[PDB]
Nucleic acid binder design. Structure first.
Length: 327
DNA sequence: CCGACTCGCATCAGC
DNA sequence: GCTGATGCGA
DNA sequence: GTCGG
């Protein structure tokens, strides 16, 4: 629904989620608050009481109490307090830098490094990832309009094919489900020569080529199967330059590729539903494989998968195109 | 009451 | 130096 | 923090 409904409550819960994760280092509380925020965000009524909210799965006694306080007073004492806490707010802020997690942010604030300006002045204390995250701090917080993702995909698919026309590349994520904007670009790559039983240059040569045509600008991490870096669309030579964007590229064995594409296309919710359903039909699906479950629950060998549809067929599901994988 | 809620890569801690 | 743990991000 | 075995 629109924010007008329960945006005050869901903003409250997301803020609380962030402090749990970045300050208290309580990742399961972070996810509990996020779960609560999402179920409330989908609730098609403006909530009148904590009790009403507690009926929703993921909202318990304490969040119901917080909702009561927020509805009565328009705020939450504990969040007002942590918001003005110099240490906690600074730790929370610093984690917006890619590469600065809760542990680094706490360490920085402990020694008086609290702002982007402070980080800019203490580059020797930043690792390579963190330096890149700082350099592109604002760019990395911008969304990517679908039209730019299409231009991005144009470049990726062209250059991949140029390196070896037998590569298979798929841009996944919400983009593949048809989303009007994305947060980053997630590219899944395979090659008929790379199987689970099989070159440690297949990923490198694609990354190199994207660097050679000046699409990839920076590297956060790169190994034999996963690249995580930065890219930028070329600008009209005249026009404003495009923001730098996060791009990941994963090399996946061919016999696990479509399980990978299915998983990294999502949704998260659709993934959970499909996995639930697979179990009930006697299969276990993870990001790599689909395997049959015996009558005592013992997993068999992975089943051949040569399309996304193969996975749907095994669990006797109607194939659904990515646009209908919302749930 | 009390435990649950994945992995590749970079880097650190320990040997 | 090498091995395993940790932090991080997704 | 919430759920549930």
């Amino acid at each position: 629904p629109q924010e007008t409904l329960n945006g005050g409550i869901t903003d409250m819960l997301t803020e609380l989620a962030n402090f749990e994760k970045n300050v208290s280092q309580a990742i399961h509380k972070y996810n509990a608050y996020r779960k609560a925020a999402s179920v409330i965000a989908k609730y098609p009524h403006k909530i009148k009481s904590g009790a009403e909210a507690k009926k929703l799965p993921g909202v318990g006694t304490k969040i119901a109490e917080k909702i009561d306080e927020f509805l009565a007073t328009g705020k939450l004492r504990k969040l007002e307090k942590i918001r003005q806490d110099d240490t906690s707010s600074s730790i929370n802020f610093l984690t917006r830098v890619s590469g600065i997690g809760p542990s680094a942010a706490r360490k920085f604030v402990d020694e008086g490094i609290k702002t982007l300006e402070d980080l800019r002045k203490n580059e020797d204390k930043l690792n390579h990832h963190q330096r890149i995250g700082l350099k592109y701090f604002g760019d990395f917080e911008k969304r990517i309009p679908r039209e730019e993702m299409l231009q991005m995909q144009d470049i990726v698919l062209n250059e991949v094919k140029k390196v070896d026309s037998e590569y298979i590349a798929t841009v996944c994520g919400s983009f593949r489900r048809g989303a009007e904007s994305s947060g980053d670009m997630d590219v899944l790559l395979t090659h008929p020569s790379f199987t689970s039983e099989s070159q440690p240059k297949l990923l490198h040569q694609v990354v190199e080529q994207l660097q050679k045509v000046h699409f990839i600008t920076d590297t956060l991490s790169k190994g034999e199967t996963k690249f995580m870096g930065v890219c930028q669309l070329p600008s009209k030579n005249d026009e404003k330059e495009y923001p730098h964007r996060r791009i990941d590229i994963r090399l996946i064995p061919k016999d696990q590729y479509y399980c990978g594409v299915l998983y990294f296309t999502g949704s998260d919710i659709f993934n959970k539903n499909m996995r639930a359903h697979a179990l009930e039909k006697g299969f276990t699906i993870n990001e790599y494989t689909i395997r049959p479950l015996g009558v005592t629950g013992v997993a068999g060998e992975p089943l051949p998968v040569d399309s996304e549809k193969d996975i749907f067929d095994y669990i006797q599901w109607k194939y659904r195109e990515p646009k209908d994988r919302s749930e």
